[PDB]
Subunit: 116 residues, 4 copies
């Protein structure tokens, strides 16, 4: 029932990516951003209770994943400064969002699963 | 504690890929393949109790996903005939294997998550 | 001898992604961004002469790809608003960058090829 | 006018994947396979003139990429035994193919670019 979920995997080690820091922001009508939550994945590459339903109204959201610190801690030199995922939420109605992210030092894949 | 799991996602639809048929085969002594299980993904893109521990000793395995029929039914003409994932497994001591698979008509991404 | 190249592919059609608009920006001292180039991919999914040697000093760069319009114009309703790639660029020795991007309605893969 | 090209990239180092051995087979009328070419990528992750026009009729093809040895040659331990890409070719006609392959030790992405 958590409206926004993440699932982060490490494609080098074949494990989830633990202790990846992230920030969730909401777009403002002027095109700026307001931070609504921060979090850190657990050893399963997930975050519980990131945000509540009330904090998640329809609109455009940005999730910034601090992948550079993840790789630096892993002993690898990464390419990207950050990984940002930007999307409109609820352009139709309700439902829950899971942002899947697969990380390599010089690449990432991101997909969404949108369900109800 | 399912020794072999799958998680299939649809990158066009933004949902798990349900009703994907697959076959699990085990490499034999003379280098052939024997089929040891079949299944179809559920609506969460998974197959529960695909094989038992007793059916899964150390060895080389092949999991064949029938992605072409998945796309043909969806109405998209796909590039690949099948998606095959081949790997050496050593499950003894509860090492669990999850094969993740992200599908598009002309591309797939596949990753493994191996427990410790 | 283009310091910065892109290669965008469409994973639904199995063709390069033509007509994708993009913006190249450089991080400024005050932490802001200054746009240094814009373009639209050709039918090979590339943009030649995106920027010159002289406009590519060391520093942080952002390339924003307008993937939403790409999909909506192909008649698909996508997940992401945009796809952003942010990286610190170096090459002291004529080192060049290729940003590869593989697009599906609800997913993208981005990788970098850095020469040397 | 190579009807079949490949492009293999390394997602750990950010370079093309050099010296990857591969084997190309064609599906026979009976459901078997016949080998029609072998090669090794150059440092650009390509193989020039893998096969001729005359060797590439419409039909089902398999490319077996020896990713396991790629990774051990890089000094890493990989998950997959091989990466097989099986696809249907240009019954109508004409059409040329590029198989793109992005490699990480525990993951790969396979896509195709099919151009007239």
């Amino acid at each position: 029932r958590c409206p926004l979920m993440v699932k982060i995997l490490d494609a080098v080690k074949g494990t989830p990516a633990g202790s990846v820091a992230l920030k969730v922001s909401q777009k403002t009508a002027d095109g700026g951003w307001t931070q609504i939550a921060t979090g850190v994945t657990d050893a399963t590459g997930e975050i519980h209770n990131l945000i509540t339903e009330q904090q998640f109204p329809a609109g455009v959201y940005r999730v910034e994943f601090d992948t550079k610190a993840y790789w630096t801690n892993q002993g690898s030199t990464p390419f990207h400064e950050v990984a940002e995922v930007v999307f409109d939420a609820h352009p139709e109605g309700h439902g829950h969002y899971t942002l899947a992210l697969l990380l390599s030092p010089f690449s990432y894949t991101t997909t969404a699963v949108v369900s109800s």
